[PDB]
């Protein structure tokens, strides 16, 4: 039960403030690689869970992002899963929050944002509309013309100009 501008500041201040030592060393993450997503994208009067972005610089680093995971003053849980999922608590006080992280290589940065905003209804219809161009997106990249390409593009506009489909806002959710 918070505001829009509330999990903007949690998430602000979140990902400004989120740190993890990994074989001694301490891995700030800050906005340059950590975009939120899901209710910020929305931008909603009110929301109950936010999600956000991770793009780690490499798959092994992707493996031992969240080793001594810690923040500077609130708390959190972190939880692992295949396939960039990354699913996260914060607790603030005997409070808690839901926050749903993506886990996705620097280069997935854009693709990241287009899956987690969706649903996959709008990833369904987009790739049946792009099988017909025979274009197709995956996590690990798309095809054209039967060739295996990466994902090479700035934010998600630029990211739908890699498939060549229109360019959609996140909070209408599809």
């Given at each position: ?15 400004s403030?989120?740190a ?103 990833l ?14 995956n996590?690990?990249?798309l095809?054209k ?30």
């Open positions: 039960m918070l505001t829009l501008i509330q999990g903007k500041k949690i998430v602000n201040h979140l990902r403030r989120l993890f030592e990994y074989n001694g060393q301490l891995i700030k993450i800050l906005s340059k690689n950590i975009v939120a997503v899901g209710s910020l994208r929305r931008e909603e009067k009110m929301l109950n869970d936010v999600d956000l972005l991770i793009i780690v610089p490499e798959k092994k680093l992707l493996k031992h992002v969240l080793p001594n995971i810690r923040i500077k003053g609130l708390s959190f849980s972190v939880k692992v899963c295949g396939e960039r999922k990354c699913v996260l608590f914060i607790e603030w006080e005997k409070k808690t929050y839901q926050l749903d992280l993506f886990t996705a290589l620097a280069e997935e940065k854009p693709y990241a944002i287009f899956h987690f905003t969706g649903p996959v209804s709008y369904i219809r987009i790739r049946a509309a792009l099988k017909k161009k025979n274009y197709k997106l996590q690990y990249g095809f013309n039967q060739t295996l390409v990466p994902l090479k593009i700035t934010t998600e506009k630029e990211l739908i100009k890699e498939l060549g489909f229109t360019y959609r806002i996140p909070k209408k959710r599809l």
